């Protein structure tokens, strides 16, 4: 199918965020006055949740599990689509075209997605998506 | 009389291999646990030319089973192996070109290079550009494994002796005529000071048993006994037949 639909996980394969996993939220399947390529609006994870053990206590756990996110306009030609898939609902609205342009707008989006992704990690959902890809 | 040339060679002065440029000494993995219980993967990271050696060398990287590090061995590259290829070493490794297997575990008829006399001496037989040994026998009790060598000699060794499946690269190097002194010159230039050669028969008798006389002649049999003593042994040593070798050779 059109596997680049708005649930898909895909690892960014180029540019700064190469190697980081993302999700699509809204695909622009062909074209933009700007972006003249098949490009996706993705919400990804820049700095992963570091592993955590029994010995890890109190505020260190709460610290080891902070996540730093990012949002990206990205050409289809730069992400490996994955079979795995994560729900998009919490930041459907928050990650949009309008979101880009104005810096101020981007951060708020990241604040949401950050609170979103962190809530999600704890309580074990998606797991793989929070695992660093080692290459 | 003087000291003849071939006895001067032994002190090693002007003689001693010309060894600056060489890649290092080719040899199989050290025969450890991994290699003698299962197998272990490797990546030929580069096939490369050893100066003064006809055969090309194969640099091959391995993980260290006991420390987090990469450890690089140096193999003589069997014909066919290639940058990027994977290489499996072990008893329980598999019969493909370039992998290394203990002689006891490949069937009769296999072809191997760089094979060990004793297991783990890291390779001794057939290393020259184009040579190899063929397994011809198995005696499962006293686990030996008869092979025929490049020379022709058959010889039995331990089934745990390792060899690498294939033939050494660069075969046929000797079919091309050197054509001129210069190429012979450069040839020995990165080997050792053994070229060019004066005929003893052109020396005076100080210099040689062949030396002297009013025409150039050898003046006595040129076959010399095994029991000859230094300063004597030069001609056809301990020869047992002599003259043009007529008739098909190939030991039976």
């Amino acid at each position: 199918a059109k596997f680049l639909k708005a649930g898909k996980v895909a690892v960014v394969v180029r540019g700064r965020y190469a190697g980081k996993k993302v999700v699509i939220v809204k695909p622009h399947d062909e074209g933009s006055k700007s972006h003249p390529f098949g490009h996706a609006l993705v919400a990804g994870i820049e700095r992963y949740p570091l592993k955590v053990t029994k010995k890890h206590g109190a505020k260190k756990v709460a610290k080891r599990t902070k996540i730093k996110p990012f949002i990206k306009v990205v050409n289809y030609n730069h992400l490996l689509p994955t079979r795995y898939t994560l729900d998009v609902e919490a930041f459907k609205s928050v990650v949009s075209t309008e979101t880009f342009e104005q810096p101020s707008q981007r951060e708020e989006a990241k604040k949401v997605v950050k609170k979103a992704f962190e809530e999600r990690h704890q309580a074990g959902k998606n797991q793989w998506f929070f695992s660093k890809l080692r290459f | 009389g003087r000291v003849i040339r071939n006895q001067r060679k032994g002190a090693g002065s002007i003689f001693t291999s010309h060894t600056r440029l060489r890649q290092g000494a080719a040899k199989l993995r050290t025969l450890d646990y991994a290699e003698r219980h299962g197998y272990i993967r490797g990546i030929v990271k580069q096939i490369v030319h050893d100066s003064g050696r006809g055969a090309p060398l194969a640099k091959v990287v391995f993980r260290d089973p006991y420390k987090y590090r990469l450890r690089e061995e140096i193999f003589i590259a069997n014909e066919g192996v290639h940058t990027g290829q994977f290489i499996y070493a072990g008893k329980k490794a598999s019969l493909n070109v370039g992998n290394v297997l203990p002689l006891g575990s490949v069937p009769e008829g296999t072809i191997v290079s760089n094979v060990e006399e004793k297991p783990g001496d890291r390779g001794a037989l057939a290393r020259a550009s184009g040579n190899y040994v063929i397994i011809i026998g198995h005696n499962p009790d006293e686990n030996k494994t008869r092979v025929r060598l490049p020379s022709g000699a058959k010889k039995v060794i331990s089934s745990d002796a390792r060899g690498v499946i294939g033939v050494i690269a660069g075969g046929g190097r000797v079919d091309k005529p050197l054509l001129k002194a210069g190429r012979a010159f450069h040839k020995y230039r990165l080997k050792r000071n053994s070229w060019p050669k004066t005929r003893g028969v052109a020396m005076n008798p100080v210099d040689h048993p062949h030396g002297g006389g009013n025409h150039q002649h050898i003046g006595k049999a040129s076959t010399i006994s095994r029991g000859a003593v230094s300063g004597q042994k030069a001609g056809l040593i301990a020869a047992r037949r002599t003259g043009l070798l007529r008739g098909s050779q190939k030991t039976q």
Binding site: - | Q46, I47, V48, H49, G54, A55, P56, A58, A77, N78, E79, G80, V81, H82, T83, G84, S94, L95, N96, V97, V106, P107, G109, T110, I111, S129, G130, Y132, I165, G166, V167, A169, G170, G171, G172, R173, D175, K176, P177, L179, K180
Partner: protein, 91 residues
């Protein structure tokens, strides 16, 4: 404009060394400088330098090959022989 009636590349050696030797060299010299097919990507870009070392223009793979040709007869025969013996030890 056929330049030489027979010596080809070997014309560099001019008159020296004797015809028979010049012939033998020409054969293997024709082989070694010649440009070969890549087992891997399939352009004809394999070339020598250093006996035994056949490395490929684009695609950049190197193969350990015969001294003046990518593949020895005897090497290739061994290939099929191992093939054969290998088969025996699984079927």
């Amino acid at each position: 404009a056929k330049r030489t009636k027979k010596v080809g590349i070997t014309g560099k050696y001019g008159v020296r060394y004797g015809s028979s030797l010049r012939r033998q060299v020409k054969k293997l010299e024709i082989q070694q400088h010649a440009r070969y097919d890549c087992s891997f990507c399939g352009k004809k870009t394999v070339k020598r330098g250093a006996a035994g070392i056949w490395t490929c223009s684009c695609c950049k793979k190197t193969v350990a090959g015969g001294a003046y040709t990518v593949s020895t007869a005897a090497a290739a025969t061994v290939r099929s022989t191992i093939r054969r013996l290998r088969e025996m030890v699984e079927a």
